Amino acid sequence: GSGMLNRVEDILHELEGQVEPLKIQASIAKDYLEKKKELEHVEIALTAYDIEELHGKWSTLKEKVQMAKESSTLLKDEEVKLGRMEVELDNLLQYLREEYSLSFEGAKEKYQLETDPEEARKRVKLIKLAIEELGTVNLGSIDEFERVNERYKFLSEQKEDL
Amino acid sequence: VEPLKIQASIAKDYLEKKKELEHVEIALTAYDIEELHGKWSTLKEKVQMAKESGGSGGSTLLKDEEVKLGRMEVELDNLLQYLREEYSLSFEGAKEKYQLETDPEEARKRVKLIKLAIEELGTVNLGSIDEFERVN
């Protein structure tokens, strides 16, 4: 014979059971990735905003401290504040590199706030909560669903010759 | 034993992607440092000539550029810190060891893609490589 003993119905039944479950996980995973994308966009914009704002404040204060010197406890208090700003500024800049591989210029160019920063920060919290409420996410299910579904479709729509 | 092979293959794929990620991240950092330093050099020169043109006193446009010049310096310093702290590298070390294979913007897209592919592997057990090599 030129035919096959194994019926395609068997593999189809084995796969059909797998389609819908993977579809659910994949739909959850895509939703997660969408919220993650939104979160990242807002966080990059906030980071660039905070860097420019904080550097501006630190620059100004550092100039006033140095201007006053050239002219004791009060002075020390300002220097402590300068130190705190410097640590925070360094952290923000290094965060930009480590988390996004973006320069400040690159971040600002592509992502700027479209609301006041506090509104953006609240938005960040709300997106994080939404992500958290998705529970356990299986990212691999997106690719796994694609493979299983395409295979199932291939065999289904051509079962007559399989 | 087969559930091990799966686990071990995942672990090795994880290691390979992390190497891939590191190379593009450091290559970009070295590239960005040199580009930023060039922009800083260009702007600093431009600031100087403005003070020579005269009448720039109290100019808010000149002040904006001076603040920008300062922010560039702080960013450069922090990029150098990042190389030291994260990879124990100097700028020249990073540049010489890690060269971009593509244009910078495509590399930036690649960074996010590799990170996602890594995250897609889920929880990785590196020790599965060991107990797999043990079954043989």
Residue numbers in the entry:
A (entry chain A): 184 to 254, 921 to 1011
B (entry chain B): 202 to 257, 919 to 998
Q: Which text from the study accompanies this structure?
A:
Next, we solved the crystal structure of a head-proximal Smc segment, named BsSmcCC1, at a resolution of 1.9 Å. Helix αC3 makes a coiled-coil-like interaction with the middle part of αN1. A short loop joins αC3 to αC4 across αN1. We term the coiled-coil interruption “Smc joint,” as it connects two straight parts of the Smc protein at a slight angle. Crystal packing does not involve the formation of a “rod-like” dimer of BsSmcCC1. To establish how two BsSmcCC1 monomers might be arranged within the Smc dimer, we mapped cysteine cross-linking efficiencies onto the structure of BsSmcCC1.
The heads undergo ATP-dependent engagement and disengagement to drive SMC action on the chromosome. Here, we elucidate the architecture of prokaryotic Smc dimers by high-throughput cysteine cross-linking and crystallography.
